[PDB]
């Protein structure tokens, strides 16, 4: 099937705090595999999956040193943004970045990603063409023009098509499953409530329906054990239980599960 790599990076300023806290987290197929936190005693990228311990000391030295470079980057950019938005000293501020690559099942590059947010809101993103930028805000135009004049896009493109694809290939060999949902319905004395539960599944993505014709739900939640939970409920007249069926749709299923109150 398809594959992906992402790095999610955060820098956070607070009022007194001399310097900002920088965190970088790396994901391969949405599972965390490396992490760097400048708050740590010895700040460095650590393996986050046993299959990463196999990387030599060159890996950890080069990656750790890159992260220190990012910390500074985020530090300087955090200063610039303050000025761009005519913000003053005394506030808390956040700068975020997502970057990485999507591969198809053939392992070819489907899509590069490079996006940034300031105060949790879209700031500037590299378009899918990997050549042009989108930047909504007026303040963002100082950066867009700066980055057009500097040819940054070409350099982000080179990383996205080269190094990102290349090391994901490597990681995927070193890292060598969907857990299906077990479903069941519960009964609660609302006129009664039918609650279709879904449990033990991975990945989180899932749909639950209630029926004949096409309801309360909860957001998908982690069990804490790597797997996910969800439920969905409807209010139903008494005795009229069997007239209602729940369908669960998940990628790990051979076909959608069908259930009723039993």
């Amino acid at each position: 099937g398809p594959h992906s790599m992402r790095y999610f990076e955060t820098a956070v300023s607070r009022p007194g705090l001399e310097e900002p806290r920088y965190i970088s987290v790396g994901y391969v197929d949405n599972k965390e595999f490396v992490r760097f936190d400048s708050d740590a005693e010895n700040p460095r990228y650590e393996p986050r999956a046993p299959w990463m311990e196999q990387e030599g000391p060159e890996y950890w030295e080069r990656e750790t040193q890159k992260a220190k470079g990012q910390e500074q980057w985020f530090r300087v950019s955090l200063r610039n943004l303050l000025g761009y938005y005519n913000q003053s000293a005394g506030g808390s501020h956040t700068l975020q970045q997502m970057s990485g690559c999507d591969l198809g099942s053939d392992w070819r590059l489907l899509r590069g990603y490079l996006q940034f947010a300031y105060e949790g809101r879209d700031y500037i993103a590299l378009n899918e063409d990997l050549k042009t930028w989108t930047a909504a805000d007026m303040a963002a135009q100082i950066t867009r023009r700066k980055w057009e004049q500097s040819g940054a896009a070409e350099h982000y493109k080179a990383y996205l098509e080269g190094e990102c694809v290349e090391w994901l290939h490597r990681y995927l060999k070193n890292g060598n499953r969907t857990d299906s949902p077990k479903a069941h319905v519960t009964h609660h004395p609302r006129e009664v409530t039918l609650r279709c539960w879904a449990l033990g599944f991975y990945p989180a993505d899932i749909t639950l329906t209630w029926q004949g014709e096409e309801m309360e739900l909860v957001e998908t939640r982690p069990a804490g054990d790597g797997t996910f939970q969800k439920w969905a409920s409807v209010v139903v007249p008494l005795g009229k239980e069997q007239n209602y069926t729940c369908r669960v749709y998940h990628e790990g299923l051979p076909e959608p599960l069908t259930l009723r109150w039993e």
Partner: peptide, 9 residues
């Protein structure tokens, strides 16, 4: 491997 950004904002 992580990207190392280019020009600052």
């Amino acid at each position: 491997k992580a990207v190392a950004n280019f020009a600052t904002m």
